[PDB]
Each structure stands twice: as C-alpha cells, then as structure tokens.
Design a protein around this ligand. Structure first.
Ligand code: HEM
Ligand SMILES: CC[C@H]1OC(=O)[C@H](C)[C@@H](O)[C@H](C)[C@@H](O)[C@@H](C)C[C@@H](C)C(=O)[C@H](C)[C@@H](O)[C@H]1C
Length: 403
C-alpha cells in the first residue's frame, strides 16, 4: 500500500519504534530513499544472512548491462571522487577485497594499536584538563570530537594541511540531503585533494606512521598497493578512523548520563566498562544502515530481492530485534551483547574494532572518573540527533561539569 520513505521524520524521531513496526510487518520490505527504490532489512536473522551472502556486492564501481549502480552514500559525488572514495576494502568484493585487507592487516595490527594506549591516555588527560572544573561545556566540541581526531592524525602522520578543516568536510558528508547535493560533492572533492597531497608528502618524507608503512608494505603473492588503492585506503582510514568513535563517545556519554543506575554500576565495578561500551554500540549503532547491491536475485527471509536492487541492511534495527536481544529497548551494561551487528558481520567485519574499543574505554573512564557530579546540561528530550542513516551521532552536547 504505502512504501516507506527513509527521508521522512519517522526515521529520525523515536525512529527505533518505527523500525519495530516495519520488522513486525516484514523484516524485508520495499522502501524509497533519495528518489530510488530499495529494500530495507530490519530483522536480525535477515540482516545477518544478508551481510553473509556474497551475491550482495559491496563494490559500487562495478558495471552491469543496462544498469546504473547508485549507492546513496555517494549522493552528489562526481565520478572520479567516488572512485577515490571507493577503491578500498569496504568497497571491494573478493578476490580484490581479500588482498587489500591482508596487505593492510600486515601493518594495522593490534600491536600498533596497543602501542598507542599511553598516547591515548595522555591526549584524553590533556583535553580534560582544559575543560575546567565547573560550568557548562559542549562535551562534543571539547572532548568527544578532538580525541578521536588527534589519535587518527598521529596514526596516519597528519599534521600540515587543513588538519582542522577536514572535520568540516567530513560533517557535510555524513548528511545526505538532496538539496545540499552540490555542497556535499564539493566537500568530498576537498577531502580527496587533501589526501592526494598527504600521500605525496609522505612518499617524499617517510616516517614510522601507518601511512608510511602502507606505502612500503608488500606480499610475495598479493604484491602491493597501487597508487589509487593506497590513496583510497588512506582516505577511508582517516574518515572512518574517527567519525564513528566521536559518535561512540558522545552517545555513550549521553546514555550513561540518562541511566544513573547503569553509570553507578560502572563507577563501582571498573572491570565492567568493556561490556558497557559493547551495549552502547548495540543500543544505538552509529552505522545505522549499511549498503549492498544485488548482483543476482537473492532470497532473504522468504522474500525474493530482484537482481540489481539496492539493499539497505539496518544494522541498528537488527540490534533491537527482540528475537535476538530480549527487552531490546532497555540499555543494560550487564546484558549479553554477543552477536550485535555494530561492527558488521562476515568478511567486511570492522578492522578498527581494537582501536574503537580502546578509545571508548579510555575516554568514558577518564570522563566520569574526573567528574563525579557530571550531569546533562539540557533536558534529555531536547538532545538533537544527527539526521543520517549513514552515521548516527550527537553534534552538540551540553554537560554541567560540577552538577
Ligand atoms: C565505534 C567505532 C566503529 C564502528 C561502529 C564501526 C563500524 C563498522 C562497520 C559496521 C563495518 C562494516 C561495514 C560493511 O559491512 O559494509 C566497518 C568496517 C570497517 N571499519 Fe569500522 N567501525 C568503527 C571504527 C573504525 C575505526 C577506528 C577504523 C579505522 C581506524 C575502522 C575501519 C574500518 C574498515 C577499514 C572497515 C572495512 C573492513 C572491510 O571491508 O574489510 N572502523 N566498521
Ligand atoms: C561517504 C561514504 C563512506 O562513509 C564514511 O566513510 C563514513 C564517514 C564512515 O563513518 C563510515 C559509515 C564507517 O564508519 C564504516 C561503517 C564503513 C567504512 C569503514 C567503509 O568502508 C564504507 C565503504 C564507507 O567508507 C562509506 C559508507
């Protein structure tokens, strides 16, 4: 009768109740978004199956007869910039995906991540010393946002260039508004230009950073990264290396602030902080939806998805599927969070999980341990949520440091 429109307010206002209504009617249903027809998967079993079914491609660069592949996430991106945004593991199918991921894994290791633990502790300490001891402060602008950025910039050796402006480009990209399509494509071109200069700069002056190491990495069978592969990987690692963590920290702070019972338990038992981060991810997944393209007709949950269809897997909705997580709408730092889809599932499983968990744990521990009277600076129902199916988050969050 009525095909949902992902641009309506139903998907940005108490939107989880809207997901629950669709899932109950059909975990796989037709929808409209950005002017195109698509399928939305809101069931946990359906979502898991989808992400595991390789007939559902992750590569937007592939050409098929008489069809125009259009991933929403690239709204307003010129052809060349899109290619720069999509020649990396997250936008590649095996066997290309397999080799790109292996070459990067050789340098982006748990070892390199763990070695940054002290640095992350220090950056976190410094940002907190600067907020003061009292009054109202935007915890996002003064903490949640800068922390992940400083960490990713040091990992990739980013210093010069618009080190404070790319944050501005990244923001416009997180929103997909048909109106601001041109401004979105222009910001994307700016990030590309920025990466090209960075890579060229690093080739000229090597260091011990992750970028320098990827430029030299090579395997006997797999070989090495091409100039374009190298550029695109740097680009995504830079953007995805911090945006999602900013969401994790902001949303995590908000959640603990509105659930004293859960916060008390964390302050009491510190060894329980790791699972709290996991529940924060399950409750409100930053990457609410992930995109796939049907290279062949595929059946999901008894529903035949026609070949050449765009498929939107609602990771966020799946994490709220009652059949998988009982009392889904309840934030519980003590619940079993195994199987959530916030880090993905299958061959594209999120490579930054170790870094993300590190940043989340260190940040929330330092924040609440430094301010025992920390409280929200505004009414809970007045917090403004980012309008993005791509990456959910809180852009502004007033907190009272001394209660
Ligand atoms: C709270 C933080 C994070 C969340 C929730 C998150 C979530 C995800 C998800 C859902 C996927 C799979 C997407 C798909 O299947 O298409 C993914 C993939 C990936 N993530 Fe993360 N991520 C986070 C942080 C990071 C960080 C810190 C980095 C990098 C420093 C990173 C790098 C990647 C990469 C490279 C992939 C592509 C993996 C592949 O295609 O093989 N992520 N992430
Ligand atoms: C503009 C489109 C791109 O988005 C972004 O880079 C966003 C800023 C990130 O927050 C995304 C959402 C990530 O956090 C991860 C979930 C997925 C990421 C690692 C990919 O590989 C994926 C192909 C991605 O690059 C694109 C969707």
């Amino acid at each position: 009768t009525t095909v949902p429109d992902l641009e309506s307010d139903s998907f940005h206002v108490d939107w989880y109740r809207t997901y629950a209504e669709l899932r109950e009617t059909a975990p796989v249903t037709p929808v409209r978004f950005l002017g195109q027809d698509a399928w939305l998967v809101t069931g946990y079993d359906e979502a898991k199956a989808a992400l595991s079914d390789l007939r559902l491609s992750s590569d937007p660069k592939k050409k098929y007869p008489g069809v125009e592949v259009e991933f929403p996430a690239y709204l307003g991106f010129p052809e060349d910039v899109r290619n720069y945004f999509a020649t990396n593991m997250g936008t590649s199918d095996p066997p290309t995906h397999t080799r790109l991921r292996k070459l990067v894994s050789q340098e982006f290791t748990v070892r390199r991540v763990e070695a940054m633990r002290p640095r992350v502790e220090q950056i976190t300490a410094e940002l907190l010393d600067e907020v003061g001891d009292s009054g109202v402060v935007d915890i996002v602008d003064r903490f949640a946002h800068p922390l992940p950025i400083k960490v990713i910039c040091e990992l990739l050796g980013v210093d010069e260039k618009y080190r404070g402006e790319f944050g501005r480009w990244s923001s416009e990209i997180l929103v997909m508004d048909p109106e601001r399509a041109e401004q979105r494509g222009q910001a994307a071109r700016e990030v590309v230009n920025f990466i090209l200069d960075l890579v060229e700069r690093r080739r000229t002056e090597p260091g011990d950073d992750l970028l320098s190491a990827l430029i030299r990495v090579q395997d006997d069978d797999d070989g090495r990264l091409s100039a374009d592969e190298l550029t695109s990987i740097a680009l995504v690692l830079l953007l995805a290396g911090f945006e999602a963590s900013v969401s994790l920290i902001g949303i995590g702070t908000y959640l603990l602030l509105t659930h004293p019972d859960q916060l008390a338990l964390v302050r009491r038992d510190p060894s329980a902080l790791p699972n709290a981060v996991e529940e924060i991810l399950r409750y409100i997944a930053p990457p609410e939806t992930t995109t796939r393209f049907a290279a062949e007709e595929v059946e999901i949950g008894g529903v035949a998805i026609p070949q050449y269809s765009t498929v939107l897997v609602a990771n966020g909705a799946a994490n709220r599927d009652p059949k998988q997580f009982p009392d889904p709408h309840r934030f519980d730092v003590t619940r079993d969070t195994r199987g959530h889809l916030s880090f993905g599932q299958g061959i594209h499983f999120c490579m930054g999980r170790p870094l993300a968990k590190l940043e989340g744990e260190v940040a929330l521990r330092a924040l609440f341990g430094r301010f025992p009277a920390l409280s929200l600076g505004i009414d809970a129902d007045d917090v403004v949520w980012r309008r993005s199916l791509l990456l959910r988050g809180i852009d502004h969050l007033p907190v009272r440091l001394d209660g």
